[PDB]
């Protein structure tokens, strides 16, 4: 079980990657920065590599934002009222609100960061969750969705096992880590909506990588 989705081997992907003026553009930059280092953490993910080409190009363009959000959210367990970007900058909610993204920004703080904090989500659990998000069989175009589903299911496999002999006194650990996933989806969807708004109003400097993930083929 803990065998084909070697938990501790995802960590070696979590870790093998984990060391302005306007809030939005600081966020959109820490984004485009994190994109590159995402394509990495993936390419270093237990089997992700093997899967077809045009397929990895899909699986990622599919959950890049939720993958990234889950990350910076985890990274911010420590900080009090805001997130901490990959660019080292702390972004407070007051900052968010001035930019009119106060409410989504807040959903991130309470439904994600706070949750992850109030439950000690570890760096492994995180990685599985992101693994799961990474392995989304329903992604359109995927050539042989069959395979991706295999992978993902194999993650619930380890993750539950993993949760099993590591926080044994906690029965529902597993459910509880998975129940942040819908919120991640919910929030990610919204964020995505705002970015398209910041784009088709052409004001925010969106760098090039983030710009590709933001443009259809």
């Amino acid at each position: 079980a803990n065998e084909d989705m070697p938990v501790e081997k995802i960590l070696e992907a979590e870790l093998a990657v984990e060391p302005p003026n306007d809030p939005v553009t600081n966020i959109c930059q820490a984004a485009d920065k994190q994109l590159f280092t995402l394509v990495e953490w993936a390419k270093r993910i237990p089997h992700f590599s093997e899967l077809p080409l045009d397929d990895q190009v899909i699986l990622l363009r599919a959950g890049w934002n939720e993958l990234l959000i889950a990350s910076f959210s985890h990274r911010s367990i420590a900080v009090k009222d805001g997130i901490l970007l990959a660019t080292g900058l702390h972004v407070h909610r007051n900052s968010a609100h001035s930019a009119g993204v106060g409410a989504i920004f807040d959903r991130v703080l309470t439904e994600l960061v706070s949750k992850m904090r109030d439950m000690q989500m570890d760096k492994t659990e995180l990685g599985c969750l992101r693994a799961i998000v990474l392995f989304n069989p329903d992604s359109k175009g995927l050539s042989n969705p069959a395979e991706v589903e295999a992978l993902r299911e194999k993650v619930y496999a380890s993750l539950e096992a993993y949760c099993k002999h590591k926080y044994p006194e906690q029965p529902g650990r597993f459910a509880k880590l998975l129940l942040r996933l819908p919120a991640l989806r919910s929030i990610g969807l919204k964020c995505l909506e705002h970015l398209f708004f910041f784009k088709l109003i052409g004001d925010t400097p969106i760098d090039t990588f983030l710009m590709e993930m933001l443009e259809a083929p």
């Binding site: 994109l35 590159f36 394509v39 993936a42 390419k43 080409l53 990895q56 190009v57 990622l60 363009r61 090039t208 990588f209 590709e212 993930m213 443009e215 083929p217």
Partner: peptide, 11 residues
């Protein structure tokens, strides 16, 4: 399609 990601993935 899309370059940078398509590529980058590889190497």
């Amino acid at each position: 399609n899309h370059p940078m990601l398509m590529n980058l993935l590889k190497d």
